[PDB]
Amino acid sequence: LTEEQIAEFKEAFSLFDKDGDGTITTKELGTVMRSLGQNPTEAELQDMINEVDADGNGTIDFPEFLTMMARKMKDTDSEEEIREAFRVFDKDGNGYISAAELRHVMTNLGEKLTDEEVDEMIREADIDGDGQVNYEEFVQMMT
Ligand SMILES: CC1(C)c2[nH]c3cc(Br)c(Cl)cc3c2C[C@@]23CN4CCC[C@]4(C[C@@H]12)C(=O)N3
Ligand SMILES: [Ca+2]
Ligand SMILES: [Ca+2]
Ligand SMILES: [Ca+2]
Ligand SMILES: [Ca+2]
Ligand SMILES: [Zn+2]
Numbered sequence: 559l560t561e562e563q564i565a566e567f568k569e570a571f572s573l574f575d576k577d578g579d580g581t582i583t584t585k586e587l588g589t590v591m592r593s594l595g596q597n598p599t600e601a602e603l604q605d606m607i608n609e610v611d612a613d614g615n616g617t618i619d620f621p622e623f624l625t626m627m628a629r630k631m632k633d634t635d636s637e638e639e640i641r642e643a644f645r646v647f648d649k650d651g652n653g654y655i656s657a658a659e660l661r662h663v664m665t666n667l668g669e670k671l672t673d674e675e676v677d678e679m680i681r682e683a684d685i686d687g688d689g690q691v692n693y694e695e696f697v698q699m700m701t
Contacts, residue, residue, distance in 0.1 A: 564624075567623065567624060567627045568620070570623075570627070571620050571623050573590075574586055574587065574590050576589070580619060580620070581615075581617040581618060581619050582607075582617060582618040582619075582623065583617050584600060584603040584604055584607060584616075587603050587606060587607065587618070588600075588603050591603070604616070606626075609626075609631055609632065610622045610623070610625040610626045610630075610631070610632050610635070611632065612625070612632045612635070612636065640693075640696070640697055640700070641693065643696075644693055644696050646663060647659055647660060647663045649662065649663065653692060653693065654688075654690035654691065654692050655680075655690060655691040655692075655696065656680075656689075656690055657676050657677055657680045657689075660676050660679060660680060660691070661673065661676045664676070682699070683695050683696070683698070683699040685698065
């Protein structure tokens with residue numbers, strides 16, 4: 559969270575990433591674990607990576623290492639990032655994105671949409687039919 563903490567985690571990442579290619583492999587993670595007296599199996603090292611492996615490529619990049627350093631699972635971390643995006647649109651903070659809020663924030667992000675384009679976007683995302691898009695409907699719209 560803090561600028562100091564993140565700088566500490568970047569130091570740790572660079573240490574673990576011995577070849578400097580920007581990703582931590584099971585081999586690199588195993589070296590560290592064994593220097594700290596553990597004896598994880600190859601399967602257990604792979605599970606440690608899979609727990610934070612948001613993009614599914616089987617190695618840890620720095621954004622996923624931040625998840626690991628926060629001691630979180632990738633599902634918790636992804637939900638937090640989706641909610642950050644949701645709050646960009648939910649300007650009044652009431653937990654629902656209105657047509658006006660969607661039109662407004664989209665316009666200020668450079669996407670000029672017609673009023674009809676906006677109405678249909680809300681209608682498509684609005685599962686329960688209340689005329690607004692709540693968080694779980696937002697999650698579903700992004701699949
Ligand atoms: C245009 C888009 C697909 C889109 N369509 C929407 C419909 C509704 Br109802 C609401 Cl509220 C918001 C959006 C957005 C905002 C989004 C979400 N996408 C996740 C990855 C890429 C992208 C694209 C974009 C993103 O960065 N912001
Ligand atoms: Ca590496
Ligand atoms: Ca990855
Ligand atoms: Ca709102
Ligand atoms: Ca709704
Ligand atoms: Zn993340």
